Amino acid sequence: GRMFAPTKTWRKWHRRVNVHLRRVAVASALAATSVPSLVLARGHRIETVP
Amino acid sequence: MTTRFKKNRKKRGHVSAGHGRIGKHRKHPGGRGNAGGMHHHRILFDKY
Amino acid sequence: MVKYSREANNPTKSSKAMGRDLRVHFKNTRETAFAIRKLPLGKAKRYLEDVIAHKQAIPFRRYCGGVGRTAQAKSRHSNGQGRWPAKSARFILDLLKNAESNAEVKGLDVDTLYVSHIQVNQAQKQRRRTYRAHGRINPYMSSPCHIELILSEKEEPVKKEPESQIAARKA
């Protein structure tokens, strides 16, 4: 039989983003490469440059 | 105890107005007119 | 033998047999196994012939609810329930004949010993359905059964040999 719930086309697979909110996140991401600790923490193997 | 047609809250937002009471507006119709002809917007927007 | 059960012996020293999907009462044919286990080949064969004739009864130690009762109980002295199912006795007799022959294939003597181990299991249940009153239908079904029979050459001489200082007098 059917079940009254189990999905059926309604469910939003679109959540809206705020551009000002998004801007902060993008900006933060650049800064994360200039601190070596986060790069190591994420699990990058690096023998990298001076 | 529930059967969700009691505590769920009945079905429809009437009986809260119907014979029960609290909230909203009471004593309803005021003026009427204007229709979809005479319609929108008289603006007030501050100069400050 | 199949994907095999409790043999516990040596395979060369033992014989194995199975009959498969014989239609017999599951309840009757086990009781035959219990009542006549370990006894020599000729004596066991004769006992089964006796059951058919009604010279010897099989004690029905288990099973009640008004189950058929002792014309004679015979072995084990008295015992309240007893029946002498002829057909199931015949089927195990045929299996016994096969087991004797199987021993020869091993290179064991036909002369060899007695039934060490028997199991009886319900192989499946065969379908058929029979009509009943009030427009309902309720099944009448038979059970095919697999029965295994083990003859073991170890059992008699191991007990006999280190009876000394007292004890022995048997075979």
Binding site: T9, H14 | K10, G13, V15, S16, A17, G23, K24 | -
Partner: protein
Amino acid sequence: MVKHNNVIPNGHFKKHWQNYVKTWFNQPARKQRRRIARQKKAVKIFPRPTSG
């Protein structure tokens, strides 16, 4: 059945909306079809603008 200082809600739903529907499922594809149509129009005209 409000238990709030809300006005009791005015829907708009107002029919079986499951029967009707309308989805923005088509919307992600939708812009692309207009855009590729514009590219095709440029090919059709060849020189001269003719945006409209």
